[PDB]
Design a protein around this ligand. Sequence first.
Ligand SMILES: *[C@@H]1O[C@H](CO)[C@@H](O[C@@H]2O[C@H](CO)[C@@H](O[C@@H]3O[C@H](CO)[C@@H](O)[C@H](O[C@H]4O[C@H](CO)[C@@H](O)[C@H](O)[C@@H]4O)[C@@H]3O)[C@H](O)[C@H]2NC(C)=O)[C@H](O)[C@H]1NC(C)=O
Ligand SMILES: *[C@@H]1O[C@H](CO)[C@@H](O[C@@H]2O[C@H](CO)[C@@H](O[C@@H]3O[C@H](CO)[C@@H](O)[C@H](O[C@H]4O[C@H](CO)[C@@H](O)[C@H](O)[C@@H]4O)[C@@H]3O)[C@H](O)[C@H]2NC(C)=O)[C@H](O)[C@H]1NC(C)=O
Ligand SMILES: *[C@@H]1O[C@H](CO)[C@@H](O[C@@H]2O[C@H](CO)[C@@H](O)[C@H](O)[C@H]2NC(C)=O)[C@H](O)[C@H]1NC(C)=O
Ligand SMILES: *[C@@H]1O[C@H](CO)[C@@H](O[C@@H]2O[C@H](CO)[C@@H](O)[C@H](O)[C@H]2NC(C)=O)[C@H](O)[C@H]1NC(C)=O
Ligand SMILES: *[C@@H]1O[C@H](CO)[C@@H](O[C@@H]2O[C@H](CO)[C@@H](O)[C@H](O)[C@H]2NC(C)=O)[C@H](O)[C@H]1NC(C)=O
Ligand SMILES: *[C@@H]1O[C@H](CO)[C@@H](O[C@@H]2O[C@H](CO)[C@@H](O)[C@H](O)[C@H]2NC(C)=O)[C@H](O)[C@H]1NC(C)=O
Ligand SMILES: *[C@@H]1O[C@H](CO)[C@@H](O[C@@H]2O[C@H](CO)[C@@H](O)[C@H](O)[C@H]2NC(C)=O)[C@H](O)[C@H]1NC(C)=O
Ligand SMILES: *[C@@H]1O[C@H](CO)[C@@H](O[C@@H]2O[C@H](CO)[C@@H](O)[C@H](O)[C@H]2NC(C)=O)[C@H](O)[C@H]1NC(C)=O
Ligand SMILES: O=C(O)CC[C@H](CP(=O)(O)CCC(=O)O)C(=O)O
Ligand SMILES: O=C(O)CC[C@H](CP(=O)(O)CCC(=O)O)C(=O)O
Ligand SMILES: *[C@@H]1O[C@H](CO)[C@@H](O)[C@H](O)[C@H]1NC(C)=O
Ligand SMILES: *[C@@H]1O[C@H](CO)[C@@H](O)[C@H](O)[C@H]1NC(C)=O
Ligand SMILES: *[C@@H]1O[C@H](CO)[C@@H](O)[C@H](O)[C@H]1NC(C)=O
Ligand SMILES: *[C@@H]1O[C@H](CO)[C@@H](O)[C@H](O)[C@H]1NC(C)=O
Ligand SMILES: *[C@@H]1O[C@H](CO)[C@@H](O)[C@H](O)[C@H]1NC(C)=O
Ligand SMILES: *[C@@H]1O[C@H](CO)[C@@H](O)[C@H](O)[C@H]1NC(C)=O
Ligand SMILES: [Ca+2]
Ligand SMILES: [Ca+2]
Ligand SMILES: [Cl-]
Ligand SMILES: [Cl-]
Ligand SMILES: [Zn+2]
Ligand SMILES: [Zn+2]
Ligand SMILES: [Zn+2]
Ligand SMILES: [Zn+2]
Lengths: 694, 694
Amino acid sequence: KHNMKAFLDELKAENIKKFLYNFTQIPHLAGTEQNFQLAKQIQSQWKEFGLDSVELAHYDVLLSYPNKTHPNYISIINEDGNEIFNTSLFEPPPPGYENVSDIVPPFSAFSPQGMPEGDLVYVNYARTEDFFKLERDMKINCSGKIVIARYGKVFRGNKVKNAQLAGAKGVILYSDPADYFAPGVKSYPDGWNLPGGGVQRGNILNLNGAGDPLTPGYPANEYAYRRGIAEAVGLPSIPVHPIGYYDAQKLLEKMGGSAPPDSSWRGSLKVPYNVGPGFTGNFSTQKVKMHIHSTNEVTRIYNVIGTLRGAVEPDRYVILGGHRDSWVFGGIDPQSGAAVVHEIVRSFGTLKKEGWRPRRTILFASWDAEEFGLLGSTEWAEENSRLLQERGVAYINADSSIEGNYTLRVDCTPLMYSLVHNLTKELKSPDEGFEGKSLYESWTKKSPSPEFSGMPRISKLGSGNDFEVFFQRLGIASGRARYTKNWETNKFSGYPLYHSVYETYELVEKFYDPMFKYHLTVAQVRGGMVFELANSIVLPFDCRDYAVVLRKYADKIYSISMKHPQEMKTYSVSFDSLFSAVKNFTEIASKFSERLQDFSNPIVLRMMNDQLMFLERAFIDPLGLPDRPFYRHVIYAPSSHNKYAGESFPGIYDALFDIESKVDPSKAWGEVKRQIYVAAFTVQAAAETLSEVA
Amino acid sequence: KHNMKAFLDELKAENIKKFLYNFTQIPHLAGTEQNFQLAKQIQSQWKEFGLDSVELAHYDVLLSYPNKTHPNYISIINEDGNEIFNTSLFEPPPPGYENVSDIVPPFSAFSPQGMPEGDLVYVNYARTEDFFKLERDMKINCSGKIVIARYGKVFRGNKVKNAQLAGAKGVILYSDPADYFAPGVKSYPDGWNLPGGGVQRGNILNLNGAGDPLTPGYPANEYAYRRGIAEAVGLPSIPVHPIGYYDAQKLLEKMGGSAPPDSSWRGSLKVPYNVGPGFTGNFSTQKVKMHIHSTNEVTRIYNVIGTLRGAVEPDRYVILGGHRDSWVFGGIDPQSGAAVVHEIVRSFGTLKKEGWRPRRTILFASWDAEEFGLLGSTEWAEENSRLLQERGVAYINADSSIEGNYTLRVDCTPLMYSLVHNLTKELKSPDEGFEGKSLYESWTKKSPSPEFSGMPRISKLGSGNDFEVFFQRLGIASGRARYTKNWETNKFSGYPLYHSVYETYELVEKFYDPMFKYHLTVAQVRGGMVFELANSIVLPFDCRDYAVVLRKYADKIYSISMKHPQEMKTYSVSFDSLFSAVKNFTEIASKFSERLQDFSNPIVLRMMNDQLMFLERAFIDPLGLPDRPFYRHVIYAPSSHNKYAGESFPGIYDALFDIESKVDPSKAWGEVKRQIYVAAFTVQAAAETLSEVA
Ligand SMILES: *[C@@H]1O[C@H](CO)[C@@H](O[C@@H]2O[C@H](CO)[C@@H](O[C@@H]3O[C@H](CO)[C@@H](O)[C@H](O[C@H]4O[C@H](CO)[C@@H](O)[C@H](O)[C@@H]4O)[C@@H]3O)[C@H](O)[C@H]2NC(C)=O)[C@H](O)[C@H]1NC(C)=O
Ligand SMILES: *[C@@H]1O[C@H](CO)[C@@H](O[C@@H]2O[C@H](CO)[C@@H](O[C@@H]3O[C@H](CO)[C@@H](O)[C@H](O[C@H]4O[C@H](CO)[C@@H](O)[C@H](O)[C@@H]4O)[C@@H]3O)[C@H](O)[C@H]2NC(C)=O)[C@H](O)[C@H]1NC(C)=O
Ligand SMILES: *[C@@H]1O[C@H](CO)[C@@H](O[C@@H]2O[C@H](CO)[C@@H](O)[C@H](O)[C@H]2NC(C)=O)[C@H](O)[C@H]1NC(C)=O
Ligand SMILES: *[C@@H]1O[C@H](CO)[C@@H](O[C@@H]2O[C@H](CO)[C@@H](O)[C@H](O)[C@H]2NC(C)=O)[C@H](O)[C@H]1NC(C)=O
Ligand SMILES: *[C@@H]1O[C@H](CO)[C@@H](O[C@@H]2O[C@H](CO)[C@@H](O)[C@H](O)[C@H]2NC(C)=O)[C@H](O)[C@H]1NC(C)=O
Ligand SMILES: *[C@@H]1O[C@H](CO)[C@@H](O[C@@H]2O[C@H](CO)[C@@H](O)[C@H](O)[C@H]2NC(C)=O)[C@H](O)[C@H]1NC(C)=O
Ligand SMILES: *[C@@H]1O[C@H](CO)[C@@H](O[C@@H]2O[C@H](CO)[C@@H](O)[C@H](O)[C@H]2NC(C)=O)[C@H](O)[C@H]1NC(C)=O
Ligand SMILES: *[C@@H]1O[C@H](CO)[C@@H](O[C@@H]2O[C@H](CO)[C@@H](O)[C@H](O)[C@H]2NC(C)=O)[C@H](O)[C@H]1NC(C)=O
Ligand SMILES: O=C(O)CC[C@H](CP(=O)(O)CCC(=O)O)C(=O)O
Ligand SMILES: O=C(O)CC[C@H](CP(=O)(O)CCC(=O)O)C(=O)O
Ligand SMILES: *[C@@H]1O[C@H](CO)[C@@H](O)[C@H](O)[C@H]1NC(C)=O
Ligand SMILES: *[C@@H]1O[C@H](CO)[C@@H](O)[C@H](O)[C@H]1NC(C)=O
Ligand SMILES: *[C@@H]1O[C@H](CO)[C@@H](O)[C@H](O)[C@H]1NC(C)=O
Ligand SMILES: *[C@@H]1O[C@H](CO)[C@@H](O)[C@H](O)[C@H]1NC(C)=O
Ligand SMILES: *[C@@H]1O[C@H](CO)[C@@H](O)[C@H](O)[C@H]1NC(C)=O
Ligand SMILES: *[C@@H]1O[C@H](CO)[C@@H](O)[C@H](O)[C@H]1NC(C)=O
Ligand SMILES: [Ca+2]
Ligand SMILES: [Ca+2]
Ligand SMILES: [Cl-]
Ligand SMILES: [Cl-]
Ligand SMILES: [Zn+2]
Ligand SMILES: [Zn+2]
Ligand SMILES: [Zn+2]
Ligand SMILES: [Zn+2]
């Protein structure tokens, strides 16, 4: 038989290991020849594996690279302008790679050029609440200062935006061992911790879903009209550079001015963590000087798009996609995910060669330039938006398969909760101590739902990965799953070697998953989801699960507003319409579910399949969210404070955020009311897509 | 048999006459009790006729009404402030209606209040080119003047916008006999001409597709958040009032200053048509004074929505809609169309009672508040946009069935050209001299295509009627057909009694269509179109017809640009991408057509039906046109100079318009290039929806 079990059993840990090794021997930086060569390799192999068609889709997008003959670095400069300390020009390469060429040195992609000199202010994680603390509570002024911030907690681009709006003239990002050195584990190469010379690369854009900075709304094809750099989307206005904790210690050790306001501001270095501004008495005349010379350059990128045509519904697309480009070797990010996709394609192709075809079309994607702001997935979705809007069933992401080895981590639309629960109950746990138990059982035990006993946690989708255009722009049901760590407060901070030269094949094979069993488990979850979506007669979505969360989000946003009872009285701020719509959705979804169970009629089936496919679509508002036109989903958006985090009822959330500080409360509460109306309306309209059609 | 002929033969001229009489005995002004009562009547009758469900959909929208105890009027005022001449407070009522209550006096709906006094400037039709002539050629300055303009040629709201931007402090609109009195015909009640006391009502908004001024993007339901009046969409900033030609003669006769620049500026009144400013020597100290006291008021409106559920594809909607509200009696506009819809519903209901159901669902609509800016259709489409976007096959409009008795007038998407040609070849001509000939034959003879011998003219869709939200916002294939006059240069000017108290049942029965044969012919065209759309196994759209027009529009826009060869050289302005996309569309459409002919498989059929349904959808750009977010179709939009006129490649057209006058040619030609890119991209993307799906 050619069923899900046949598919799943064909998947091999040994193959995932071979592919991971193959993808991580040299760097695959977006826009470089090495990454174009790997694209052509994957294209050839997917053809060999059996896909019907496999094409490269290329675009010319704005990328950013250091100047090879004019290196970026930071100094402490004394009174006469002598540079008395310089940060490192490169990370010491790991064992056996010390002769590898084309390792991009640490830099912040899309930083402008500059050589700002000034006094340091330490801003903790550079979160919105950290700047509130500095400015409002401590009366410390960042204007014209160079800010130094530790990585962690939120996307680095949010830190840079926050620093810019505080009036900073530069930002230094560093990795504190508090966040990137787990106690009792050794530094790379002898363990998975970050050494003091290690540095996290990464882009610092604030694109809000736009894709290539120069072509928002339209694919960056051969005839594209491009904005001028001054009108580009999302570029930072101040120089930015990342450093390791040996270098950070040198910049922080001399810091004076105010003490840290409390212990949540102190990392693990042997320094005071004084906020500044500037250095203590002896060194009061020394300054910090950045030297940034990176350039932004329009550069060709390449997505690989493979098609396995559906036997029955070829015009319905289930998409498995993840990126290929890496900062350096990409041993975890992304090749641990790319190797899983490769093995999934191989397994599906094995069935296809024996005469099987899925019910619906499956599209497989190897995206490029993800690290530079989700550019390859976004430009391709811009190009194909009409096809995706009317035909897209679901998008399953496939970046890093592991970021730890503790338990499963799933983020997805409520429409996929039931699918995930059911599939994980049928898969074996790879975990020690759970042998012969289901993955559902180990996951639920290790990651309990905060709301329901006997259920696992499933998180909301925000952004920071390639599902963003499909979910938040186009409203296609999306999901992701990976293995993760225990480390709760590190959720958005990355594993220690994230985006460093030390993230290698050996890191994975020695320290994360020597048997490739966690990789195989993730291949089973991702491939199992794709299989069910592409093959189930009735699409495997449960609208009632959306009803349950919508009530939870409505309770939560109302609870936020209810911290301001006098203003809700004054301005007549009612959530009644939103609860009404949520009640209606619950009622209608229950009735639709009964019909879906109670309905030989392919037109009624597909009618119902279309109602299921278009339900996520119905949460899209064509006018988008305020000042974020490419975030169009009304129930979820990336947090305006942290792109990695999903926020629910984002339009109402942002209207309420820090509202007590607004100068015109009438206007501010009027906008809360407007957002309640938009949310109630959209929930009701989505409900009505599930009513009988005529 | 229950085929199209059964449907068509059931339609009766006598029934259309009875319904027209029934709908035109009292005024049915939007927002009044009389119009709510007529809504309830139609709802009851459509239920009796056999529809499955018939509901009222109500909204609370901004309307505008004169003050009953403080009448609007215009004066000539002498030096001491004596009002020496006053315009009329009402139109003399026609025979037998002189005791009818609730006839709204002539006014310009949505005028602000004011009593501006000043010198007159005569601006011809107040078109963009008329203001260019005044300001650029004649050096006449309208700033702080009261402008007087003749109705005709363009939508009145465009005139008011043009006057406002010229700095006018008020606008007087009047009906010149040149445009509203056909030579050799008598004035109402003895003929169909406009008497000197007759006045054309009408709104003067510039909504650009927004719908209710207070709720753009969202339905004006019970919990809607409304903009404040100062942020409302489309309201004029200066007072405006309409008058008849007896009153106009009194205001124009004393005009001095400059002579009319040429004869195209002279109407038929026995006056010089001097442009002003102000009056000739003797009267130089007299001024014109307006008194406008109308108020804008949020008011409930009611659409009637009838459903005839499809037997096979209930989730595919074919919509026949037209408005019910009138300025006064609505003898032509809209009740000549509403009576036709009523008879169509009755005929379909007759088949339904004998056990027939159409293949797809047919929705019938009686829209409200059309006269106040397409408010009822727009608010309902805002409410139901998700259903319409994913399920809407086609929209057929049904306003005035006659505006003359000469020949057919059809405006529609190219996707319906073949359907119209085929249906009209099967219908009998009602025309004298064409007895026993097809409607196709009489129409093609009387209205020859400017491009093709042996073909009739079919015009583009702009706006000024209820199809606007469906076509230009949502991208649902739309069409309209009516009987019209010969009068070429009067195309956008209306028939003489348009929006006057004289537009009555008797006007129609005595002077337009005493046998109701033109009404019946239009009922056959509209009902025949709906029948084929709702019943044909393959949707009756021909994508190759879009390919042919896209080439014609590309040639036309290129020809406009090519008036500026030096700038196209300087700024490297190429149309190559747009012609490429049009060539690709032509190639792909030809291949799709072959498959549609060459393809027992309901999934392939519906796949293909979906490709046909979503083709118009593919011309929608979710970012909309520049500064007109609710005009989203890239191939067609309402002309920015005349809402009634369709413009092709509007984004490129508007970027080129008057470009030689722009201060920064680099920027202006850059925007032309941007619009060429958007157009090429959208044409290519629409083409790709017709490629094989996988
Ligand atoms: C959840 O679904 C329910 C349907 O089960 C839906 O109920 C609808 O609620 C609206 C708003 O309450 C109702 O609107 C009323 O409609 C009647 C006519 O049917 C009007 O007369 C009412 O207006 C009068 O009263 C108002 C309130 O006091 C006044 O403001 C107004 O000036 C009028 O005097 C009012 O418009 C509607 O009838 C029901 N529909 C039903 C029960 O079928 C509810 O809206 C849904 N929730 C959301 C958020 O959509
Ligand atoms: C109409 O449909 C045709 C398909 O039949 C489609 O043709 C495509 O045109 C694009 C643009 O010309 C081609 O793009 C080229 O792709 C190759 C790789 O396949 C690249 O190497 C090319 O780039 C080089 O040359 C450029 C031009 O001189 C340089 O600017 C660039 O720096 C590179 O040196 C170029 O991107 C594409 O291959 C074809 N596809 C085919 C034939 O399948 C055409 O685009 C459609 N029209 C529209 C408006 O979409
Ligand atoms: C990764 O695997 C690929 C595919 O097996 C290898 O590329 C092939 O290598 C042989 C030997 O050079 C060539 O003859 C083939 O043409 C290549 N096949 C392709 C590109 O499809 C590649 O060598 C491997 N890379 C590493 C670093 O092991
Ligand atoms: C930090 O690096 C800078 C730049 O390379 C060093 O300063 C330069 O030193 C050379 C050789 O002594 C001089 O000729 C240049 O004029 C200096 N350039 C600048 C920009 O100051 C500096 O010596 C380094 N500091 C340390 C502590 O190694
Ligand atoms: C998850 O599996 C459950 C248990 O099998 C499925 O729920 C059952 O579905 C069948 C088929 O419709 C019904 O007859 C049962 O009554 C359901 N049992 C329940 C609700 O406990 C559920 O559909 C699956 N979810 C998917 C496939 O998305
Ligand atoms: C238009 O026709 C309608 C429907 O025939 C008439 O309304 C009906 O009139 C009778 C007599 O008053 C009532 O008993 C019915 O209840 C009405 N039916 C409805 C409203 O569905 C109406 O009188 C006619 N109007 C004119 C001016 O002739
Ligand atoms: C035009 O109408 C105005 C307003 O009704 C007339 O002026 C008024 O005349 C009455 C009675 O003579 C006076 O008491 C008011 O003071 C006047 N009002 C204003 C606003 O001036 C005027 O007589 C009319 N002109 C003509 C020619 O009939
Ligand atoms: C208009 O009618 C023409 C003539 O019947 C239709 O074109 C024919 O369609 C049949 C059925 O596919 C083909 O076999 C013929 O070859 C076509 N004849 C032609 C192109 O001359 C056309 O489809 C009709 N248009 C509609 C229904 O939209
Ligand atoms: O630009 C973006 O939105 C994200 C770019 C990348 C995505 P990533 O590949 O490293 C994976 C991060 C994640 O899945 O949360 C970054 O976080 O630096
Ligand atoms: O506001 C609008 O866009 C049009 C309002 C009305 C539409 P109408 O019913 O009179 C018919 C005009 C037409 O079909 O062109 C008007 O032209 O005054
Ligand atoms: C790299 O180094 C220097 C900086 O001025 C110069 O030779 C060259 O222009 C730079 N390359 C760039 C800016 O891409
Ligand atoms: C912060 O510092 C700069 C000093 O030039 C000043 O312009 C700005 O107003 C200051 N802000 C506050 C709130 O003190
Ligand atoms: C993998 O699992 C073991 C068991 O707890 C643990 O000791 C090790 O630290 C884990 N590896 C990583 C990288 O978390
Ligand atoms: C109508 O007439 C006068 C104008 O001031 C006044 O009595 C009343 O307020 C007006 N009604 C309105 C403004 O609706
Ligand atoms: C038109 O007239 C007014 C007179 O106050 C003036 O402000 C404006 O600049 C004039 N425009 C031109 C172009 O003469
Ligand atoms: C109707 O048709 C006849 C024939 O030409 C014509 O005399 C009459 O003017 C027409 N009616 C209208 C209102 O155009
Ligand atoms: Ca783009
Ligand atoms: Ca609205
Ligand atoms: Cl992922
Ligand atoms: Cl019409
Ligand atoms: Zn990644
Ligand atoms: Zn990454
Ligand atoms: Zn009308
Ligand atoms: Zn009208």
